Amino acid sequence: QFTLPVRLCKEIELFHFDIGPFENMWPGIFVYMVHRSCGTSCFELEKLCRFIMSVKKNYRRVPYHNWKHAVTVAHCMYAILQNNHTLFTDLERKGLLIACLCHDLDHRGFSNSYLQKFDHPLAALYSTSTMEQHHFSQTVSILQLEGHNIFSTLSSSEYEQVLEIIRKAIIATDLALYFGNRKQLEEMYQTGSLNLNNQSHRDRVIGLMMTACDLCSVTKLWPVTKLTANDIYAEFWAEGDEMKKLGIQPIPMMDRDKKDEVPQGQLGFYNAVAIPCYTTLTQILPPTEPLLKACRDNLSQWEKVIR
Numbered sequence: 001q002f003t004l005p006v007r008l009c010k011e012i013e014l015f016h017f018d019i020g021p022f023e024n025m026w027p028g029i030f031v032y033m034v035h036r037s038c039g040t041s042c043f044e045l046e047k048l049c050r051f052i053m054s055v056k057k058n059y060r061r062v063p064y065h066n067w068k069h070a071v072t073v074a075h076c077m078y079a080i081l082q083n084n085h086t087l088f089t090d091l092e093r094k095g096l097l098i099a100c101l102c103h104d105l106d107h108r109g110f111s112n113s114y115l116q117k118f119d120h121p122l123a124a125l126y127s128t129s130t131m132e133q134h135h136f137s138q139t140v141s142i143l144q145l146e147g148h149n150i151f152s153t154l155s156s157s158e159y160e161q162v163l164e165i166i167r168k169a170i171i172a173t174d175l176a177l178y179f180g181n182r183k184q185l186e187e188m189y190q191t192g193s194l195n196l197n198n199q200s201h202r203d204r205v206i207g208l209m210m211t212a213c214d215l216c217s218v219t220k221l222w223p224v225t226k227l228t229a230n231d232i233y234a235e236f237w238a239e240g241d242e243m244k245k246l247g248i249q250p251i252p253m254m255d256r257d258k259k260d261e262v263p264q265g266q267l268g269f270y271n272a273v274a275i276p277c278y279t280t281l282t283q284i285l286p287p288t289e290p291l292l293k294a295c296r297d298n299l300s301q302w303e304k305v306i307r
């Protein structure tokens with residue numbers, strides 16, 4: 001039944017768009033993004049709406065890895081897609097927006113390292129990319145619910161094609177995998193061997209897009225960026241608190257007693273992770289340049305905080 005306001009129509013297209021002040025409209029914002037990416041008949045409205053509300057319900061009340069984070073990541077993907085639409089197939093356009101909304105499904109607010117170290121049942125189930133494999137499992141589980149399968153109308157080979165796009169995209173949100181991925185992609189771009197017709201290459205490009213979307217809070221306007229950083233640190237500190245209880249000293253980043261080091265930690269995160277990510281992405285997809293520009297702007301803001 002929901003209809004989005006006229007001011008948003010043009011603003012939703014921009015990379016720096018902040019979903020933050022529209023909580024009641026987030027399910028409706030996602031529906032709009034889907035119709036603009038693959039048409040009004042791309043998914044049966046009833047199916048799609050059941051799927052979204054179920055996905056929403058399966059995001060816990062954690063400070064950062066919550067419903068808001070899912071819609072934020074999906075919106076960034078929507079902007080990338082819209083600015084490079086002809087470069088992606090209808091099946092990719094569909095799969096990626098769904099993968100972004102589901103990428104942190106049922107996150108408990110603990111890193112893969114925590115679950116591995118403390119031998120959590122989830123780490124026993126999934127050896128590497130612990131949470132990520134759980135997020136893809138949670139996505140399949142939601143699709144398997146009565147009248148949720150938005151992909152039922154696709155052909156047999158086209159169905160396993162989306163589920164494989166989704167699987168690969170969600171796994172690539174494992175930051176530990178990003179570093180190698182970005183390195184292989186930088187090699188291909190420089191040597192001039194990068195070929196989007198090659199499937200293994202497309203998988204890597206998609207992988208980087210997933211990282212770029214996952215970290216997009218660094219591409220918003222400084223007041224939004226700063227407020228998201230508080231949410232991520234509230235989540236890191238809670239994890240550190242748990243480690244302390246179990247007689248383990250957490251790394252500075254997860255220690256609330258080491259709050260003064262946050263600007264220095266951010267500067268390191270932007271120099272080692274965020275800037276290289278958007279630099280490589282801009283080389284492959286030149287219309288994604290505003291993401292790099294906004295990231296550089298926030299990097300200067302963190303330097304100013306240190307100074």
Ligand SMILES: CC(C)(CO)n1c(=O)[nH]c2c3cccnc3n(-c3ccccc3)c(=O)c21
Pocket residue numbers: 173175214215216217218225228229230232266269
């Ligand atoms: C991007 C964000 C949220 C900016 O506030 N951020 C930050 O400040 N430090 C970090 C950060 C620091 C260390 C490891 N991962 C981080 N990720 C992260 C977490 C899970 C999955 C993928 C990436 C962030 O998004 C982030």
Ligand SMILES: [Mg+2]
Pocket residue numbers: 103104131173174
């Ligand atoms: Mg994740």
Ligand SMILES: [Zn+2]
Pocket residue numbers: 069073103104173214
């Ligand atoms: Zn995420």
